[PDB]
From Swiss-Prot, chain C:
Highest taxon listed in the record's lineage: Viruses
Impact when changing residue 16 to I: In strain: Omicron/XBB.1.5, Omicron/EG.5.1
Protein's UniProt name: Spike protein S1
Quaternary structure note: Binds to host ACE2. RBD also interacts with the N-linked glycan on 'Asn-90' of ACE2. Cleavage of S generates a polybasic C-terminal sequence on S1 that binds to host Neuropilin-1 (NRP1) and Neuropilin-2 (NRP2) receptors. Interacts with host integrin alpha-5/beta-1 (ITGA5:ITGB1) and with ACE2 in complex with integrin alpha-5/beta-1 (ITGA5:ITGB1). May interact via cytoplasmic c-terminus with M protein. May interact (via N-terminus) with host bilirubin and biliverdin, thereby preventing antibody binding to the SARS-CoV-2 spike NTD via an allosteric mechanism.
Protein task: Attaches the virion to the cell membrane by interacting with host receptor, initiating the infection. The major receptor is host ACE2. When S2/S2' has been cleaved, binding to the receptor triggers direct fusion at the cell membrane. When S2/S2' has not been cleaved, binding to the receptor results in internalization of the virus by endocytosis using host TFRC and GRM2 and leading to fusion of the virion membrane with the host endosomal membrane. Alternatively, may use NRP1/NRP2 and integrin as entry receptors.
Curated annotation (Swiss-Prot), chain D:
Described function: Attaches the virion to the cell membrane by interacting with host receptor, initiating the infection. The major receptor is host ACE2. When S2/S2' has been cleaved, binding to the receptor triggers direct fusion at the cell membrane. When S2/S2' has not been cleaved, binding to the receptor results in internalization of the virus by endocytosis using host TFRC and GRM2 and leading to fusion of the virion membrane with the host endosomal membrane. Alternatively, may use NRP1/NRP2 and integrin as entry receptors.
Species whose genome carries this gene: Severe acute respiratory syndrome coronavirus 2 (2019-nCoV)
Subunit structure as annotated in this protein's UniProt entry: Binds to host ACE2. RBD also interacts with the N-linked glycan on 'Asn-90' of ACE2. Cleavage of S generates a polybasic C-terminal sequence on S1 that binds to host Neuropilin-1 (NRP1) and Neuropilin-2 (NRP2) receptors. Interacts with host integrin alpha-5/beta-1 (ITGA5:ITGB1) and with ACE2 in complex with integrin alpha-5/beta-1 (ITGA5:ITGB1). May interact via cytoplasmic c-terminus with M protein. May interact (via N-terminus) with host bilirubin and biliverdin, thereby preventing antibody binding to the SARS-CoV-2 spike NTD via an allosteric mechanism.
Mutagenesis / variant outcome for changing residue 43 to T: In strain: Omicron/BQ.1.1
Name of the protein in its database record: Spike protein S1
Renumbered residue ranges of the record's region Integrin-binding motif: 2-4
Superkingdom assignment: Viruses
Lineage start: Viruses, Riboviria, Orthornavirae, Pisuviricota, Pisoniviricetes
Recorded consequence of changing residue 44 to P: In strain: Omicron/XBB.1.5, Omicron/EG.5.1
Gene: S
């Protein structure tokens, strides 16, 4: 269990990057290459939060 | 009136998909760099990698 | 709606932008200043008065 | 300017006028006041001074 808890926590922390958190996409380069600054800096703000 | 005047309206719908693409912009392709860390732009997919 | 298939071609939106009969733009999901910097599979045009 | 070009003048917005004469910066905090000046600028058979 000591090994498995750390392995499961690291796997969960790795798999958490796929979530959008309300943004239109989970890819920062896609957001930056698709949108302007004034809304890119609130979509990336949501992703960073 | 201007609100009653006719308008030509065109809706353009694009397919931003994780798929092979046929329509691209005016900028063109450069030469390939292998086994070296560079910035890259593959069909709008931007990033930094080897 | 005459669904126009735009495919296998270079989309120059500066050609449409430089033309005089182009007054009101409103783009959703893609910033209109970056329409020349993306690639799409197929483009569908609909035109109506 | 001709009135349909003034909307180019914005932070980061493209266009020939805003690209080749003066660009507004991206962090620009400002105000834009425009008014039609036909009787002040437009003459008979055109005004070529602009």
């Amino acid at each position: 269990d000591v090994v498995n808890h750390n392995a499961q926590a690291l796997n969960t922390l790795v798999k958490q990057l796929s979530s959008k958190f309300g943004a239109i996409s989970s890819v920062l380069n896609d957001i930056f290459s698709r949108l302007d600054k004034v809304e890119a800096e609130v979509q990336i703000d949501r992703l960073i939060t | 009136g201007v609100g009653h005047q006719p308008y030509r309206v065109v809706v353009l719908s694009f397919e931003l998909l994780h798929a092979p693409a046929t329509v691209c912009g005016p900028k063109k392709s450069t030469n390939l760099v292998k086994n070296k860390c560079v910035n890259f732009n593959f069909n709008g997919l931007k990033g930094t990698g080897v | 709606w005459n669904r126009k298939r735009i495919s296998n071609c270079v989309a120059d939106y500066s050609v449409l932008y430089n033309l005089a009969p182009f007054f009101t733009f409103k783009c959703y999901g893609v910033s209109p200043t970056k329409l020349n910097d993306l690639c799409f599979t197929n483009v569908y045009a609909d035109s109506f008065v | 300017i001709r009135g349909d070009e003034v909307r180019q003048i914005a932070p980061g917005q493209t266009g020939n006028i805003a690209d080749y004469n003066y660009k507004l910066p991206d962090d620009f905090t400002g105000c834009v006041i425009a008014w039609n000046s036909n009787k002040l600028d437009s003459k008979v058979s055109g005004n070529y001074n602009y």
